[model samples]
Target: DADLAKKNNCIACHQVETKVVGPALKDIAAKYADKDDAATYLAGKIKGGSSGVWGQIPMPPVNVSDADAKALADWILTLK
Candidate 1:
């Protein structure tokens, strides 16, 4: 998972439990802990940046493939 995050450059602005340019993955995971559509929702956010969700600074769109996006989302949602 760390490899995947590095490959996607997510480390630049995100941490497991702290906020950065974006919200922490653990917070996201907790936010969508019971949501069934987390993967789908996060996938879109990953591919097409999101604003007004975490804060003013929008999370820029990541240059990642669909499969990778989904995989990332899945991995994030697994954080407890």
Candidate 2:
């Protein structure tokens, strides 16, 4: 499942202890992890893109299908 993120090239933008262009996966993982809608909402974030959520640096659409993004969100939210 994590391969799907690398398949989508999300790993190119985020990985370890710092941000490459978007927030680091583990950091952003918990930033929204406590929310009631974490999984689905993050899928929305993945598909919808964002402006003010992180910073002036925007997260463009991950360019994947909804089901894939949903799976990515599921993988994402369960981390750290």
Candidate 3:
């Protein structure tokens, strides 16, 4: 749920559909929805970090548990 996202500070940079400092969740979902490994990759990106994919600005690593990260990634994918 988005409650998880808010608790983890994801909303600081990302929104459901509109542009923020980070890419919108729907856009990320749209780009990743067709990939078999989308969850895994997005999970890693959330917990680790990602750069140069959305834009020049980068998303630093977030302090979330592995399970929560995976859950968030999967949830974001569903936004597509």
Candidate 4:
């Protein structure tokens, strides 16, 4: 569930309702949906961690396994 993934630390930077440090989930999904491989794009971003995509603030590398991170990103993309 989204709540579990988020409670486990996925929301440290990203948010669904609003942007805190990183981009909001809805905005990220909207911005990247046109990509040919949105799932891979986000999975890579989540697994490897990233910076400069949104701004100077960097998304910390999450400890979750690749599958779990991918699950979180996939669910987030489906929002809206």
Candidate 5:
């Protein structure tokens, strides 16, 4: 997960507990914890990007393979 985050530049805008250009990963995990498809949805967001969810700042689509994206999503869900 660390490798993927670094390779995809996710660390530039996101962290575990602190907000940067985007909200923290833990915040996102907590926000979507109740959803059954959180990992699926987040993986899609990682691949497709999103806006107006966290704020005016948009999360651009990451340049990672589909498998890597899904793996990252699953790893994120495991974080508290």
Candidate 6:
């Protein structure tokens, strides 16, 4: 649910298809598609946040369950 991201302030840094303060979901999906465990990998990143992989602008750890992270990752992957 996109609304969940907004509710949790993720929209401040990311968008569905375009770059904001951070890379877009489309970019992230494309970057990780070659990995065999892309979904799981991204889910962890989403929940735990990431750094260096994208740049100096760090992604903040989202306060969400694994299931929510999976749902968000699944949606992000589809942006490609």
Choose 2 or 5, whichever is better by lDDT. 5
Off by over 4 Å in 1: none
C-alpha displacement of 8 in model 4, angstroms? 2.7
Per-residue C-alpha lDDT of model 5 across residues 1-80, encoded as one tens digit per residue:
87788787899999888999999998888888899989999999999999999899898888788999899899888777
lDDT of 1 by residue, 1-80 (tens): 77898789998999888998889989999999998798999999999999998789988899899999999999999886
User: Model 5, stretches more than 4 Å misplaced?
Assistant: none
lDDT of 6 by residue, 1-80 (tens): 68877876779989878889889878988987788888899889988989888778888888888888888878777777
Our tally of clashes for model 2 stands at 0
* Candidate 5 lDDT: 0.89
**Alpha carbon deviation, residue 31, candidate 1 (Å):** 0.3
Candidates 2 and 4: which is better by TM-score?
Answer: 2
TM-score list, all predictions: 0.94, 0.88, 0.96, 0.86, 0.93, 0.87
Over 4 Å off, model 2: none
Task: Give the per-residue lDDT digits (tens) of candidate 3, residues 1-77.
Answer: 69999999999999999989999999999999888899999999999999999789989998899999999999999
Best by lDDT: 3
Clashes of 3: 0
- Comparing 4 with 5 on lDDT, the higher-scoring candidate is 5
User: What local lDDT does model 2 show for residue 36?
Assistant: 89
- Write one digit per residue (lDDT tens) for candidate 2, span 2-79: 688889988888874578888878887879878888988899889988788777888887788989998999888767
Poorest stretch of ten by lDDT in candidate 1: 1-10
Q: State the local distance difference test value for candidate 2.
A: 0.83
Q: All candidates' lDDT scores? A: 0.90, 0.83, 0.93, 0.78, 0.89, 0.83
TM-score: model 4 vs. ground truth? 0.86
Give per-residue CA lDDT, model 4, range 1-80, as digits (tens).
46855676767766787897888888888887787778788888877889899889888777777778788778867875
lDDT of 2 at 45: 88
Best by TM-score: 3
